[PDB]
Design a protein around this nucleic acid. Structure first.
Length: 145
DNA sequence: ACTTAAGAGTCATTACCTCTCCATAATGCGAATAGTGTTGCTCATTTGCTCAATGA
């Protein structure tokens, strides 16, 4: 399943506020290590094109996201690539198509070990994004309420 | 009315092998158009799987 429409836009807006918060570099580096090794591949003098949230609410959003997404680094990397840096979904899917190993395909390759197409790459990064938001949402209500 | 000069045109064997060589220069500034990226969406293709008769 997935979320409803109002919950999707609410979580999307809160995550881009949180992404504009971490994009300045105001996250303390001892708190987590995956954002620490994500934010080292970007210049320190970044520009601010998005509205930025305040300190402790962004601290609350950062602590809940690395408490629920501390088991995997790939889906968390997609999340920081879409929301923190601000890259679009199509660029993420194009780079994942240009990198990923040959996989077994069903109902179109007949089991042939081949590279994934761009359409299934867009579909799997959309599924990864929707699954990460479904892991974010009820634990975020548990942190808020 | 016919007879020598001037000028143009068109060829001058076949087959093969090796090597080298085949370019340089006005600037700039908006307007406008073609190109590429983005997101949402539909459509054709294939495959494991399921359902219905039927005789042994």
């Amino acid at each position: 399943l997935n979320l409803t429409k109002e919950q999707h836009e609410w979580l999307n807006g809160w995550l881009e506020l949180w992404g504009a918060w971490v994009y300045s570099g105001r996250l303390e580096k001892r708190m987590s290590s995956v954002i620490a090794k994500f934010m080292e591949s970007v210049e320190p003098g970044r520009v601010m094109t998005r509205p930025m949230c305040n300190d402790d609410d962004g601290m609350l959003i950062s602590q809940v996201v690395d408490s629920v997404m501390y088991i995997d680094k790939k889906a968390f990397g997609i999340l920081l690539s879409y929301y923190a840096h601000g890259s679009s979904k199509h660029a993420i899917a194009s780079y994942y198509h240009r990198v990923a190993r040959p996989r077994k395909m069903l109902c179109r390759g007949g089991g042939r070990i081949q590279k994934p197409s761009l359409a299934t790459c867009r579909r799997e990064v959309d599924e990864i994004l929707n699954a990460s938001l479904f892991m974010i949402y009820p634990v975020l209500d548990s942190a808020f309420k």
